[PDB]
């Protein structure tokens, strides 16, 4: 790939892409590398390249970067955000939250994007207003307020 | 995109998928959203946020003010196919406001970590011959720019 | 994706790309499209490969001329993938050659025999080239009992 | 790589894979594998395959002779993202005894069929707005070479 999305841990890269290669569609465990024992592993995420590196504690992940992942219905944003969320991650603000391993996701309905984005900014406006009382995303919540 | 790569940014998302756009190969700005009302770090009708992609990545550009900062905790590794690509890419986030740093990385003015990383040099890194591996691994650890032409002679 | 691979079927291309999500490693239906105006493309990975399958008619007709080579990583493995692709309506071909029930060619080829017919060793690497002539599916042990 | 793309030529695949090299971005030879004994189309010392990528694609060319032939069943479809790489790629295949087909569909001199398809175009036809998919749709029917801009009048 031209361009892979390179994400620092502290001895748990394989585990990591592991537990995504489970968890999401389209995800894969593609190659583990040791050094010149694990020192880097090739993944992919939702069709996204990626490469774990191993490295010790020295960078920590912030909010600056996360994977927005956009969901069908309430199902879907509730699977996923119970897997991430109960596999020693965290709830956060507005659809986002946190991983085990510190890295953050946003399990954003797409009723939700599409609601926020709308040339209807009344609609669009209750829709913000009401995304930002929630943690997780309600989905019938935010359509009734868009209507 | 099922999965996008949302990157924060202190009200500086448009100027930065801009220069993205006009920077890397295959990249381009795709659609500006306006803010549908007042939120802690903007105006109802700023942008709020930048959809873009980069060399075949699909990404979020965030207008959420300076409550977050970047790190190495993240980066972009960006494959080049020789030094002239290398020596663009590198330059351009470099001298965009940003910073070198060692072993190929690199940040842009928004804080950004970028890899410009030769695919010579990492073939060598993960070559079955693993001492020639070391070799590369040492001789990358004296660069901050990558030299192809270094890389394979440590290798050979 | 900057560059995908278009493969044409005849009203199966969503069966086809299920098939290899099932089958193969890295490999998923991503997306299925209807007509402008029943699926007349989907979007799809195998191995990593982006794909799209479009549905436009029994106007072309596949040949060796285009295939995937899959590498394997022991007999086990190249047994399974082989016996998917002949079992589901498929057929062997020679030197680990298969074509699938769309018509598309298929190599099973174990990284050994990739390895044994590029080596710089002339000799080694001509006994497994012609020991692979003899073969459909290919057999890792007798490759490398050749090249021995 | 895991999986390869692997296309027939007559005794020129290193011919292919240097063309394509030098033609689209991103693309390279990494590797030549000559015949360790004769063969039905070679002798031993001939080029057997050839290792490239083409835009991300892992590929493979392999000299089998004539025995067969390429069609429309097998494509790569290459995504613009201006009327200038549009032209470009477009003029470099057909030019280079190749043959202009339809749609964006065109055939380099071996024989294999590339689409070069501005992305404007995929998304118009994919659009959820179904009767202006439509429109692009009955547009790119009326072309060999893509025009973007006529491909947005029809969808707009």
New interface residues.
């Given amino acids: 790939?031209?361009?892979?999305?390179?994400?620092?841990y502290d001895s748990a890269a394989l585990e990591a892409a592991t537990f995504y290669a489970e968890t999401?569609?389209?995800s894969?465990v593609?190659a583990v590398?040791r050094a010149?024992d694990v020192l880097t592993v090739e993944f992919?995420?939702?069709?996204?390249?990626c490469?774990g590196l191993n490295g010790g504690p020295?960078?920590?992940?912030?909010?600056?970067?996360?994977?927005?992942?956009?969901t069908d219905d309430q199902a879907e944003t509730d699977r996923l955000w119970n897997a991430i969320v109960d596999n020693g991650g965290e709830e956060s603000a507005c659809g986002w939250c946190r991983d085990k391993w510190?890295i953050s996701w946003?399990i954003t309905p797409r009723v939700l994007s599409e609601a926020?984005?709308?040339p209807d900014?009344a609609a669009?406006?209750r829709?913000?207003?009401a995304m930002?009382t929630m943690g997780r995303i309600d989905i019938a919540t935010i359509e009734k307020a868009f209507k």
């Fill in positions: 790939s031209k361009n892979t999305i390179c994400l620092w999401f569609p389209d894969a593609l590398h010149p992919r995420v939702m069709g996204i390249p490469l020295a960078f920590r992940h912030s909010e600056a970067f996360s994977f927005q992942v956009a510190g946003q926020i984005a709308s900014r669009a406006r829709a913000f207003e930002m």
